[PDB]
């Protein structure tokens, strides 16, 4: 199959800035018939994809002319001359030269730029309600941070626990353009009571050292 | 040109699913109906396409013999059947007319899970602001709704997408308020899971 390599995975922009998204195919998309079936779609949040550019450089019905596409052979680029708010979302290239199957790039998320912000880290012990049923979940919120990339570890009595972790992440905040993350570590009550120190440890651009919040079970 | 797809599907491993796509606007028999699915991760994978004037099909070999596409011309409706389901098949499935216009998607969840009510747990602490939360653990299927103080607390909230793990979903939500507001005032999460008849208010009490 043709593999479509998209770069970058994530493209932070300020409104009004230029944006360029590149797609490189694993072989030429020039068909023996002389056409290049390389198309671009945008999927806005909570929406289905919509066609923007077809056959490399043709804008689809209704598409604003800030969108343009160019390229040839194995390399293609979508450009937005001046980004508008409605343009944020996930862009995908797709090929239909070598079919079946049609194939797609992984997607490039156009997101908003803002000032770096350290996460607000909050850690929570199990509730007494959960403990009565024999379970014990520890939760860490890492909130309102920028940029998006973050990594979290749980450390119990100074040792990492990897099993039993459930992580989730919000899309970019509609008011402040930050990101947030929740991490839940689930143990049995017996395992929880076997240890005293619980630590949620993050790495983020905003600190060269780890960012930690801890509690003692008591 | 509008493509209306059928609602969410839940199946056990090894079972089949059948999804529909009702087309309106343009000529039904003028466009091949393509089908594409969107995995967790947002990647897209083309499944196949059908000509509706006479019914010929083309498949991505990955689905050949597992997927079946059909149309009903008398109702401008295309169907996708997929059998021998596994969790790899949990995805949002789109119909797409000539690769130009997309349906709204149909969620397919493949899981061994029976409907299960969440357990709702408060998140209270063990600065200028204080963050509280609620943990909505071990339910099936989606969706859940969560509010704080019956929707009166809207700013400062982060309600995380649910995650399926070990065949049950967990969700959480944080709310941040000024430190002068709690514990003095009341903060309650309101959780509904209609599939299980669940309607729970969990007041967050200081520990």
């Amino acid at each position: 199959d043709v593999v479509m390599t998209q770069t970058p995975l994530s493209l932070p922009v300020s409104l009004g800035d230029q944006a360029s998204i590149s797609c490189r195919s694993s072989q030429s998309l020039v068909h023996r018939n002389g056409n290049t079936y390389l198309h671009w779609y945008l999927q806005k949040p909570g929406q289905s994809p919509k066609l923007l550019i077809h056959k490399v450089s043709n804008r689809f019905s209704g598409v604003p002319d800030r969108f343009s596409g160019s390229g040839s052979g194995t390399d293609f680029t979508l450009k937005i001359s001046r980004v508008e708010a409605e343009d944020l979302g996930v862009y995908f290239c797709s090929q239909s030269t070598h079919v079946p199957p049609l194939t797609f790039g992984a997607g490039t998320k156009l997101e908003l730029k803002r000032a770096d912000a350290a996460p607000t880290v909050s850690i929570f012990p199990p509730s007494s309600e959960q403990l009565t049923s024999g379970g014990a979940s520890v939760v860490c919120f890492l909130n309102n941070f920028y940029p998006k990339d973050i990594n979290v570890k749980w450390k119990i009595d100074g040792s990492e626990r990897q099993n039993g972790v459930l992580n989730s992440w919000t899309d970019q905040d509609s008011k402040d353009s930050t990101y947030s993350m929740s991490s839940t570590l689930t143990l049995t009550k017996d395992e929880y009571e076997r240890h005293n120190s619980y630590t949620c440890e993050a790495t983020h651009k905003t600190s060269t050292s780890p960012i930690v919040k801890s509690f003692n079970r008591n | 040109v509008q493509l209306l797809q059928s609602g969410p599907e839940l199946e056990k491993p090894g079972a089949s699913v059948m999804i529909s796509c009702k087309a309106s606007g343009s000529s039904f028999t003028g466009y091949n109906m393509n089908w594409v699915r969107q995995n967790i991760g947002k990647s897209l994978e083309w499944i196949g396409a059908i000509d509706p004037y006479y019914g010929g099909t083309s498949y991505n070999q990955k689905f050949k013999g597992r997927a079946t596409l059909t149309v009903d011309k008398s109702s401008s409706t295309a169907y996708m059947h997929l059998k021998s389901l596994t969790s790899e098949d949990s995805a949002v499935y789109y119909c797409v007319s000539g690769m130009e216009y997309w349906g709204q998607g149909t969620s397919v969840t493949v899981s061994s899970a029976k409907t299960t009510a969440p357990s709702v747990y408060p998140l209270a602490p063990v600065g200028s602001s204080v963050t509280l939360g609620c943990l909505v653990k071990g339910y099936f299927p989606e969706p859940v709704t969560l509010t704080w103080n019956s929707g009166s607390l809207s700013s400062g909230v982060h309600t995380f997408p649910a995650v399926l793990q070990s065949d049950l979903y967990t969700l959480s939500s944080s709310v941040t308020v000024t430190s002068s507001t709690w514990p003095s005032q009341s903060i309650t999460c309101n959780v509904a899971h209609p599939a299980s008849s669940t309607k729970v208010d969990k007041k967050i009490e200081p520990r």
Partner: peptide, 15 residues
């Protein structure tokens, strides 16, 4: 049937 985006998909003529 031949659709402009999809080349030879279900379209012998486009080969």
């Amino acid at each position: 049937v031949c659709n402009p985006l999809t080349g030879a998909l279900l379209c012998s003529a486009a080969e």
